[PDB]
Amino acid sequence: MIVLFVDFDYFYAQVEEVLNPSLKGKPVVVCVFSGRFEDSGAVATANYEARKFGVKAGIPIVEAKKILPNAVYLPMRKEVYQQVSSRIMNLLREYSEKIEIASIDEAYLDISDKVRDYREAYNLGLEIKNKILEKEKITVTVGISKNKVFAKIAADMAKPNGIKVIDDEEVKRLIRELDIADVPGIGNITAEKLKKLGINKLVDTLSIEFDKLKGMIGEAKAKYLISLARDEYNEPIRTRVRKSIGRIVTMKRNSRNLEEIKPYLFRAIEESYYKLDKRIPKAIHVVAVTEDLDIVSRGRTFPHGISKETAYSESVKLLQKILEEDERKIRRIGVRFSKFI
DNA sequence: TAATCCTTCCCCC
DNA sequence: GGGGGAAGGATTC
Ligand SMILES: [Ca+2]
Ligand SMILES: [Ca+2]
Ligand SMILES: [Ca+2]
């Protein structure tokens, strides 16, 4: 099999540059301003100009300014980006029917048909990198391999703005040499548990007795790693479906008083519905971010579709259930709609 | 600025 | 025992 993974470089900041070329060659930081206090918020993404110095996704907006006090700071604009992305996901469709849109900027292609070997593979990587650069003036990175996991890893290496192949032989050394923590789906926490169990390489997973790996990190995860290590991973490419929509927001001050919260909660549903568009959910969830930054949630399924009027009531009851079964204050509040018709 | 996998529950064959 | 399906939380991106 031969899978080609495509990944957009620092996407949000690149589109920002694209939309005002002057920004070219400068450190651009796409930020999310919570508006709580002076320059409060976080970092959505920074371009190469900023990254290399430390500014990265997750750092506060105040920390970033201490490093690059004079870079460009712009508020995120999901809508525009999302649309830019949509277009690009099309140039690709025009490269196969088997396309999996993993995220707003990640996508996998199943070219096992078209191309005959890694040779023609590269040609198409290039032929593809180009197209998107022409049509939309945006740089990406290609990864090619026996499957989605490596095609992706393939892309993490050759980044930014590169293209890389990882053929069987090389995969082999990776299953052994490649770090366990650098394997897709293994976040700190897991990579951590995998530490104790003495696992540090995909190989290491073959020594331990399954059931101890299962009682630890989970059967799915466990099986996932195994198949990978034994060189038997091969999940196909499928067209994923938005199985949920929501929208959380923050208040100027943490609160516990229901009246003080409602207004925020509604604004949340309001936007959530706008997103929904044409879609009708059967499930609802109120999500609260307590002051200590711990997420608390309460929801409910209905035997029918939820109207907007219904959401307003349902959400105010589930929020009450939250202030009840919890004494902490709320820093953020939002709704999540699922189980569409 | 959603996907997925778990774990525990609560019927009820 | 175990199918089926919330519900709430844990984990990755
Ligand atoms: Ca990226
Ligand atoms: Ca990782
Ligand atoms: Ca908790």
Describe the structure.
By secondary structure, the chain is an alpha+beta fold. It folds into four domains: 2-10 and 78-166, Alpha-Beta Plaits, CATH 3.30.70.270; 11-77, MutS, DNA mismatch repair protein, domain I; 167-233, 5' to 3' exonuclease, C-terminal subdomain (DNA polymerase, domain 1), CATH 1.10.150.20; 244-336, DNA polymerase, Y-family, little finger domain (Dna Ligase, domain 1, 2-Layer Sandwich). The chain has twelve helices and twelve strands. It has helices at residues 11-18, 48-51, 61-67, 78-93, 118-136, 148-157, 168-176, 188-196, 210-217, 219-229, 258-276, 308-324, and strands at 3-8, 28-33, 41-46, 72-75, 99-100, 106-110, 140-145, 163-165, 245-255, 283-290, 295-301, 330-338. The strands form three sheets. A five-stranded mixed beta sheet has the order 5-6-1-7-8. It has a four-stranded antiparallel beta sheet with strand order 9-12-10-11. A hairpin with a 7-residue loop joins strand 2 and strand 3. Helix 9 crosses helix 10. The longest helix is centred in the middle third of the chain and has 19 residues, at 118-136. The radius of gyration is 23 Å and the shape is globular. The chain starts with a strand and ends with a strand. Bound molecules: calcium ion (3 copies). One calcium ion binds next to strand 1. It binds a DNA duplex (13 and 13 nucleotides) through helix 8, helix 10, strand 9 and strand 11.
